[PDB]
């Protein structure tokens, strides 16, 4: 409750069960996994347990919004998340994730990639755990939510029973879970920077 999150705020986003932050960096998924599956070779999105500049995300409105400074983000509004350190937009799509062929790969894309043909795939919602809470204010620390992908209806998920390989620096895998109702899909806004 510490504070209300407004559009264009910079935030950190923390997983409740593992305490890992939603994280990104310049490293890319390997073109192929050991089982032969093909990734997008896109920018990695991971779970990182330590405070870091690369945990910062800017919350943005959809195209054609007319939103300005000082306006609260509400639960279940469509939003976009820009990775501050690399200036890329979060995206999910129907590509098998590193460890779970049934779950979706999560990546980021450049401003140009994200504002053109792929724009619809950059839309998320802070989805309330109880749908009756839609339209309530997003606040730091005290409001749990699912990071829900509008286009494919997955919730972002992570775990720490198995960590990524050396190419992922033993960070937590992040992927899109098609089973939306799962406590391991729950996140909070940890702080407003």
């Amino acid at each position: 409750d510490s504070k209300t999150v407004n559009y264009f705020d910079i935030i950190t986003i923390k997983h409740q069960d593992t305490d890992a932050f939603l994280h990104s960096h310049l490293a890319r998924y390997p073109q192929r996994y050991e089982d032969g599956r093909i990734s997008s070779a896109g920018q990695q999105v991971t779970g990182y347990t330590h405070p870091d500049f690369n945990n910062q995300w800017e919350v943005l409105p959809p195209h054609g919004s007319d939103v300005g400074k000082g306006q609260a983000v509400l639960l279940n509004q469509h939003i976009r998340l820009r990775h501050v350190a690399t200036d890329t937009y979060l995206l999910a799509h129907d590509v098998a994730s590193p460890f779970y062929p049934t779950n979706e790969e999560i990546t980021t894309v450049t401003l140009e990639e994200g504002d053109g043909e792929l724009y619809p795939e950059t839309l998320f919602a802070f989805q309330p755990l109880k749908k009756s809470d839609e339209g309530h204010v997003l606040k730091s620390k005290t409001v749990s939510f699912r990071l829900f992908h509008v286009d494919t209806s997955v919730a972002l998920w992570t775990h720490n029973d198995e960590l990524l390989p050396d190419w992922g620096f033993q960070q937590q895998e992040i992927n899109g879970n098609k089973k939306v109702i799962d406590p391991s899909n729950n996140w909070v806004v940890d702080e407003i920077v």
Partner: peptide, 5 residues
């Protein structure tokens, strides 16, 4: 390339 399944 590889879709989910």
């Amino acid at each position: 390339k590889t879709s989910t399944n």
